């Protein structure tokens, strides 16, 4: 079975752009190999922001962005806002399975 | 707000079953993008529906997501052993992303 690795940690500056990425044990994340990105706070439920590696919700902020970044999936934000601070985790979805990394921590300093 | 799957439902082999998952809050329109997954013990769970209704590449059409009432649902028709599993719904709007307890199917032999 396939291990997901997200970064533990991560600090942007409020106004700042941040890379969030999302790598697989197993190989490069191409095609078909599909990244969701969820965005939590604590006491609250998590909200989807993308699916399908680079699409978005009608409620995903435009400074959210994903991507695939070498052989890794990525979430750039852009313009970062206090109300980003939050944990993101990341699914990688194919036929072997739906797997969860274990998050970022974003801070916003 | 909380999903809600049955617990558990049976089928014979080559019969239909459906299962539903429903909002403590209202009706499941469209809006709430019901997402399905199949688990096996000890084994990564697999998506298989998105967006209510929508397969991937890998989903037998054995299986379809509709509305049905009030509730999302899924209906496996023909049912095979290996259908036999863990099935769990997710519920996603703007408000947050859900899963319901998830629903234990037995295949009879
Ligand atoms: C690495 O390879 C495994 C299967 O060999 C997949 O589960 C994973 O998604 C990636 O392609």
């Known amino acids: 079975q396939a291990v997901v690795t997200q970064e533990p940690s991560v600090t942007v500056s409020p106004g700042g752009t941040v890379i969030l990425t999302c790598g697989s044990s197993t190989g490069a994340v191409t095609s078909g190999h599909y990244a969701n990105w969820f965005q939590q706070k604590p006491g609250q439920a998590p909200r989807a922001?993308?699916?399908?590696?680079?699409?978005?919700?009608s409620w995903t902020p435009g400074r959210f962005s994903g991507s695939l970044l070498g052989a890794k999936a990525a979430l750039t934000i852009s313009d970062a806002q206090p109300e980003d601070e939050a944990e993101?985790?990341?699914?990688?979805?194919?036929?072997?399975?739906?797997?969860?990394?274990?998050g970022t921590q974003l801070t916003v300093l | 707000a909380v999903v809600t799957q049955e617990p558990s439902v049976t089928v014979s082999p080559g019969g239909t079953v459906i299962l539903t998952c429903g909002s403590s809050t209202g009706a499941v329109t469209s809006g709430h993008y019901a997402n399905w997954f199949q688990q096996k013990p000890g084994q990564a769970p697999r998506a298989?529906?998105?967006?209510?209704?929508?397969?991937?590449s890998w989903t037998p059409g054995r299986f379809s997501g509709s509305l049905l009432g009030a509730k999302a649902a899924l209906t496996i028709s023909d049912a095979q052993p290996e259908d036999e599993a863990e099935?769990?719904?997710?519920?996603?709007?703007?408000?947050?992303?859900?899963?319901?307890?998830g629903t234990q199917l037995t295949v009879l032999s």
């Open positions: 699914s990688l979805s194919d036929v072997d399975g739906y797997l």
């Open positions: 967006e209510t209704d």
């Open positions: 997710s519920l996603s709007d703007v408000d947050g992303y859900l």
């Open positions: 399908e590696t680079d």
